Amino acid sequence: IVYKPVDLSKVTSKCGSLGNIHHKPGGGQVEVKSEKLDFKDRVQSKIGSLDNITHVPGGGNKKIETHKLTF
Amino acid sequence: IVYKPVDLSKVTSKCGSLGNIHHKPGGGQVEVKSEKLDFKDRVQSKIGSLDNITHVPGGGNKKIETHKLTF
Amino acid sequence: IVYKPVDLSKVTSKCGSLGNIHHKPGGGQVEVKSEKLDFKDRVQSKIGSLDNITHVPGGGNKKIETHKLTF
Amino acid sequence: IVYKPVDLSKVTSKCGSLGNIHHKPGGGQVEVKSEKLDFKDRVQSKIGSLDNITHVPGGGNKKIETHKLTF
Amino acid sequence: IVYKPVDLSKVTSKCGSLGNIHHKPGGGQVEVKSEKLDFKDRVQSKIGSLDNITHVPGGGNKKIETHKLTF
Amino acid sequence: IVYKPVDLSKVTSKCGSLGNIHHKPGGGQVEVKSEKLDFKDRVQSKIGSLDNITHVPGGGNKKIETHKLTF
C-alpha cells in the first residue's frame, strides 16, 4: 500500500476595501452656517471629514488536520 | 494499492469594495444655511464628508482535513 | 505500508483596508460658522479630520494537527 | 441500609415590579391653570410627579427541616 | 436497601409587572383649565403623573422537609 | 446504617422593585399657575417630584433545623 495524497490547494478571503483608487477626493468646497439651533439629545456630525476607518472583528482562520494509521 | 489523489483547487471570496476608481469625487460646492431649528431626539448629520468606512465581521476561513488508513 | 501524504496548501485572510491609494485627499476647503447653538447631551463632531483608524479584535489563527499510529 | 436523598431544588418568588424598562417617560408637557377654586375638605394632588414607591410587608421565607434516626 | 431519591425541581411565582417596556410614555400635551369650581368633600387628583407604585404583601415562601429512619 | 441526606436547595424571595431601568424620566415640562385658591383642610401636593421611596417591614427569614439520633 502506497498512500501519497497531495494537497496544493488555496482557501482565500479578500474582504472589505481592497485595491481602490481615490484620486483628489474632496477637492471642492463646503460652507456650513448655523445660527441658533437647540439639541436636546445626542449629536453626531461630520463636515468635510474624509476619514479612513477599518473595523475587522472577522478574518480568523482554522486549519484542523487529523491523521490515523491503524494496523 | 496506490492512493495518490491530488488537490490543486482554489476557494476564494472577494467581498465588499474591490478595484474601484473614484476620480475627483466631491469637486463641487455644498452650502448649508440653518437658522433656528430645534431637535428633541438624536441627530446624525453628514455634510460633504466623503469618508471610507469598512466593517468586516466576516471573511473567516475553515479547512478541516481527515486521513485514515485501516489495515 | 508507505504513508507519505503532503500538504503544501495555503489558508489566507486579507480583511480590512489593503492596497488602497489615496492621492491628495482633502485638498479642498471647509468653512464652519456656528453662532449660538445649545447642546443638552453628548456631541461628537469631525470637521476636515482625515484620520486613519484601525480596530482588529479578529485575525486570530488556530492550527490543530493530530497524528496516531496504532499497531 | 444507605439513606442518601438529595435536594437541589429551588423555591422562588418574584413579586412586584421586576426587569421593566421606562425609556424617556414624561417627556411631554403639563400645564395646570386654576383661578379661584375652594376646597372644604382634604386635597391630595399630583402634577407631573413620576415617583417610584415600593411597600414590601411580604417576601418573608420559612424553612423547617427535621431529621430523626431511631434504633 | 438503598434510598437515594433526587429532587432537582423548581417552584416559581412571577407576579405583578415583569419585563415590560414603556417607550416614550407621556410624550404628549396636557392642559387643565379650572376657573371657579367648589369642592364640599375630599379631592384626589392626578394630572400627567406617570408614577410607579408597588405593594407586595404576598411573595412569601414556605419549605417544610421531614426525614425519619426507623429500625 | 449510613445516614447521609444532602440539601443544596435554594429558597428565595425577590419582592418590590428589582432590576428596573428608568432612562431620562421627567425630561419634559411642568407649569402650575394657581391664582387665589382656598383650602379649609389638609393639602398634600407633589409637582414634578420624581422621588424614590422604599418601606420593607417584610423580608424576614426563619430557618429551623432539628436532628436526633436515638439508640
Distance CA F13, CA D63 (A): 13
β-bridge mates for residue D18, sequence order: E18, F18
Q: What is the DSSP string of B9-65?
A: -EEEEEEEEES-EEESTT-SEEEEEE-S-EESS-EEEEES---EEEE-S---EEEEE
Q: Which residue has cell 445626542?
A: A42
Query: Could you give the 3-state DSSP secondary structure of residue D62?
Result: strand
User: DSSP string of F19-35?
Assistant: S-EEESTT-SEEEEEE-
Through-space distance between the first and last CA atoms of chain A, rounded to whole angstroms: 12
Question: Cβ A26–C27 below 8 Å, yes or no?
Answer: yes
Point out which residues pair with A13 in neighbouring strands. Answer: B13, C13
Q: Are A61 and C9 in contact (CB under 8 A)?
A: no
Q: How far apart are CA E4 and CA E6, in angstroms?
A: 6
Q: Which residues on adjacent β-strands are paired with residue C62?
A: A62
Contact in structure between F11 and D58 (CB atoms under 8 Å): no
Chains E and D touch (3+ CB pairs under 8 A): yes
Residue F59 sits at the vertex; the CA angle it makes with F55 and F64, to the nearest 5 degrees, is 160
| DSSP structural state of residue D38 | E
CA angle D22–D28–D33, rounded 5-degree value: 130
Which of C8, C13, C39, C63 has the most B C-beta neighbours within 10 Å, making it the best mutation to test the interface with B? C13
> Which DSSP state fits D60?
-
Whole-Å CA distances, C33 to A31, B47, C37, D56, E30: 8, 14, 11, 57, 38
Q: Residue C24: which residues within 8 A CB-CB, separation 6 or more?
A: A23, A24, A27
Closest CA to D23 of C7, C6, C63, E25: E25
* Integer Cα distance of B4 and A7 in angstroms: 10
Whose CA is closest to A65, among B70, B13, C58, C68?
C68
Q: Which of A63, A64, A68 to mutate to test the interface with C (most CBs of C within 10 A)?
A: A63
Residue of A37, A61, A69 with shortest CB distance to C3:
A69
Backbone angles phi, psi at B4, to 5 degrees: -135, 50
For residue D49, the SS3 value is: coil
The neighbour count for residue D45, using CB atoms within 10 Å, is 19
- Tell me the structure's resolution in angstroms, rounded to a single decimal: 2.6
Cα gap C38→C22, rounded to integer Å: 37
Running DSSP on this structure, what letter comes out for residue D40? S
Is-contact A33 B34, C-beta < 8 A? yes
Residue F39 CB burial class (10 angstroms; 0-12, 13-18, ≥19): middle
The secondary structure of chain C as a DSSP string is -EE--EE--EEEEEEEEES-EEESTT-SEEEEEE-S-EESS-EEEEES---EEEE-S---EEEEEEEEEE-
Q: Show the cell assigned to F66.
A: 432539628
Among D7, D34, D41, select the one facing E41 at the smallest CB separation. D41
Question: With a CB-CB cutoff of 8 Å, which residues 3-62 of chain E face chain F?
Answer: 7, 26-27, 48, 52, 54, 56-57, 59-61
Q: Are C5 and A67 in contact (CB < 8 Å)?
A: yes
